[PDB]
Design a protein around this ligand. Sequence first.
Ligand SMILES: [K+]
Ligand SMILES: [K+]
Ligand SMILES: [K+]
Ligand SMILES: [K+]
Ligand SMILES: [K+]
Ligand SMILES: [Mg+2]
Ligand SMILES: [Mg+2]
Ligand SMILES: [Mg+2]
Ligand SMILES: [Mg+2]
Ligand SMILES: [Mg+2]
Ligand SMILES: [Mg+2]
Ligand SMILES: [Mg+2]
Ligand SMILES: [Mg+2]
Ligand SMILES: [Mg+2]
Ligand SMILES: [Mg+2]
Ligand SMILES: [Mg+2]
Ligand SMILES: [Mg+2]
Ligand SMILES: [Mg+2]
Ligand SMILES: [Mg+2]
Ligand SMILES: [Mg+2]
Ligand SMILES: [Mg+2]
Ligand SMILES: [Mg+2]
Ligand SMILES: [Mg+2]
Ligand SMILES: [Mg+2]
Ligand SMILES: [Mg+2]
Ligand SMILES: [Mg+2]
Ligand SMILES: [Mg+2]
Ligand SMILES: [Mg+2]
Lengths: 97, 42, 112, 51, 95, 55, 118
Amino acid sequence: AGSQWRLQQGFAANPSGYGPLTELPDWSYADGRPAPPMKGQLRRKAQREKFARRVVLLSQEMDAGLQAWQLRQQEKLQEEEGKQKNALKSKGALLQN
Amino acid sequence: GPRALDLLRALPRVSLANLKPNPGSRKPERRPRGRRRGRKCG
Amino acid sequence: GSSKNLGGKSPGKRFGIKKMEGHYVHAGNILATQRHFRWHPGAHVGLGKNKCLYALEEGVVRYTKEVYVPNPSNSEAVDLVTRLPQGAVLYKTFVHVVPAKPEGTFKLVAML
Amino acid sequence: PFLTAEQERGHAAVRRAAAFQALKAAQAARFPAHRRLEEQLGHLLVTRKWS
Amino acid sequence: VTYFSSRKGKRKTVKAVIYRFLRLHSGLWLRRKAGYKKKLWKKTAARKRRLREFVFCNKTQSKLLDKMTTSFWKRRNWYADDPYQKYQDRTNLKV
Amino acid sequence: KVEGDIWALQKDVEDFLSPLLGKTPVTQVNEVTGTLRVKGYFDQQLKAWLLEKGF
Amino acid sequence: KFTRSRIPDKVFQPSPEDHEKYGGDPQYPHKLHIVTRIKSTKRRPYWEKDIIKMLGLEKAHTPQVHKNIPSVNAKLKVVKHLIRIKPLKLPQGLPTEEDMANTCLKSNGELVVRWLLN
RNA sequence: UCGGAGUACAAAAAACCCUCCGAGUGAUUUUAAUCUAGACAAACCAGUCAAAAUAACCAUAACAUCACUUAUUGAUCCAAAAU
RNA sequence: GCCUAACGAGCCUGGUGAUAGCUGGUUGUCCGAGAAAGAAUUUUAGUUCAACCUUAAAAAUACCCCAAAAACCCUAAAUUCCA
RNA sequence: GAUUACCCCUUCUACCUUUUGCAUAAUGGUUUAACCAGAAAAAAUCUAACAAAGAGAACUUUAGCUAGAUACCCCGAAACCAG
Ligand SMILES: [K+]
Ligand SMILES: [K+]
Ligand SMILES: [K+]
Ligand SMILES: [K+]
Ligand SMILES: [K+]
Ligand SMILES: [Mg+2]
Ligand SMILES: [Mg+2]
Ligand SMILES: [Mg+2]
Ligand SMILES: [Mg+2]
Ligand SMILES: [Mg+2]
Ligand SMILES: [Mg+2]
Ligand SMILES: [Mg+2]
Ligand SMILES: [Mg+2]
Ligand SMILES: [Mg+2]
Ligand SMILES: [Mg+2]
Ligand SMILES: [Mg+2]
Ligand SMILES: [Mg+2]
Ligand SMILES: [Mg+2]
Ligand SMILES: [Mg+2]
Ligand SMILES: [Mg+2]
Ligand SMILES: [Mg+2]
Ligand SMILES: [Mg+2]
Ligand SMILES: [Mg+2]
Ligand SMILES: [Mg+2]
Ligand SMILES: [Mg+2]
Ligand SMILES: [Mg+2]
Ligand SMILES: [Mg+2]
Ligand SMILES: [Mg+2]
């Protein structure tokens, strides 16, 4: 067993998890040409690629959403100064003052 | 027009031995025999 | 012994609040039904003979706490107001319906 | 949290809208499949013989 | 309901349904409110008006009455000066 | 009552109704019978379209 | 009667010693979650079952990545006793389009872009 | 069988041969119309509200009231009365 | 009491395949989805509706759901509603 | 399950019916052969003919009409009436 030790060292808890004992091809032709890939290995490399795309998609949406909020904050302030620089010069009591 | 008639020359002759009803026209009947339709018969 | 209590069985009348704040209601929808005066009617809200509140105009239902000024012809209510100390005012809850659709619009029907 | 409640207001809504639209499109394509002559004329191959 | 009669072998109808229901060609059935002739002095003005109004029947009641009557009463009829003649067909029904 | 290349008829229908709906309509082709089935009520539009083509 | 449990906001106030104990960053919160389900939805109320279903945690011991926005955190707090949550670390940064197929997620919670080169 | 309070503490619903009150109608005149949007309630049958419009009368007049006001009630068929 | 080995009323045949909400039985393989009870009822050993569910079909929104919001003497866990 | 080896070892509370729940000390069966129990097309869905019309008369018709396919058991009372 000893899964706690393996997790401490960075390896998988189960020795069948993404270790060098699993990823590498178990058999090859004698002459030296590579063997056809395993069905399991190809499937395992499809969910990892799918997982990586999800991380990139999630990271970009959060960053893009943050940018939109900053734009609105600047837009709100720029609109406020527009009203100040668009009204008329208050004459009122300042004419006699 | 009927280009399917060209295909009939290659195919064997149509007789009573090879005739099939239109698929879906005859839903099969279910009889109360077996584990599924059994011991209560619905 | 024997049971003395009789007639205790009666189904509920489903008295309660129907439309919460923010619901879009049309004219005639019953906003709420009640036994006693729990919510008083407000703007654009009628009042039936059985004290049910129904919206009069199409719009958004809103709930509000406002002051209470009773009708002078209501002897019991005006007496309660009379005995209050000078620093107090009655507060009650009200149901409003802010209109959404305008009354109407002007359109060109004929250009002579 | 990384973002506050206000900064996440509708940050990812086009994807949510597109996901629902894809669901409607796939569910609206439900229709009987095409019927071709090869399926009907392929039954005559039952009695194929060696002459 | 007599599914198979003993004389002709056809499907009979229940005369109770026809004497108190009207079937429109759209499938909807028509009926009177219960108690529209009993103790009128006791009921209020609004209640009497409600009891004097024709009403429709829901799906289960409509489906029930279609299995109790034969196919003669579901036909299309063109009566002269029929008040319900314009209600026979449904219109603008987006289901 | 369609004779000939039915798939030509289906393609001509698809791009005829595409601008009206914004999407390709769902169709069924029945070569054993010669019948094209289109999902929706387009009978009036199709009758005018076939009349212009002279069928 | 048994009903939902309301978690007071005083629970989620971290002590100054919490950051050093769990290896968190005192100033900048992490960006992405890694959620792994541990226990079972059985013998638990129905509202906890739906939250597990709608978070993609149907299969146990399978990591799933979620954002750190309050909307996701609101649902995680309900089922925080059925899942394991670890931060997502990026020693080499976000993967590019060239290295999508070589990514591997280690147990300690870091995503290695280039795995078993050559 | 029907209503009110608690059990049923805060939207609705919720039981017992569970704990306590009632109803099977009176008093009075303001004798309370016709027609229709939209809703509450509900297995069904039933029950409830209701703007606009028309008539009645201040000549641009609709909630019968009071008694905890909530309950004061009965489906077809059939019978009798003017219809 | 007895009337051909069973008499609170004989035996045989016919009506008779009497009728049972009650008990027992219900015959090949494999696969998909899958329900514990709200309302009336000489009704609670049963039926007919509603809910739930199955098969097919159409359509757009469903769950989670922040702030605001829901009673007057005191009142917990918490519900309703909603981006 | 195995095993060089039949046992020895290890692991498993008969089967249907009926129930909230049956190894139950709840029901039935000694075993074998033969015999013994789902049946109907009004509305509907699937396939096809022809289509504002369909059907080999009599009818149905605001996309309908005609034809086919898909359906709903067996054994048992005490009794009642006539000859
Ligand atoms: K069965
Ligand atoms: K019974
Ligand atoms: K026994
Ligand atoms: K028994
Ligand atoms: K048995
Ligand atoms: Mg069947
Ligand atoms: Mg059969
Ligand atoms: Mg059996
Ligand atoms: Mg009760
Ligand atoms: Mg009570
Ligand atoms: Mg309702
Ligand atoms: Mg008025
Ligand atoms: Mg009767
Ligand atoms: Mg004898
Ligand atoms: Mg029998
Ligand atoms: Mg029961
Ligand atoms: Mg049902
Ligand atoms: Mg809230
Ligand atoms: Mg919503
Ligand atoms: Mg046991
Ligand atoms: Mg028992
Ligand atoms: Mg059972
Ligand atoms: Mg036994
Ligand atoms: Mg027994
Ligand atoms: Mg025995
Ligand atoms: Mg039929
Ligand atoms: Mg008799
Ligand atoms: Mg006799």
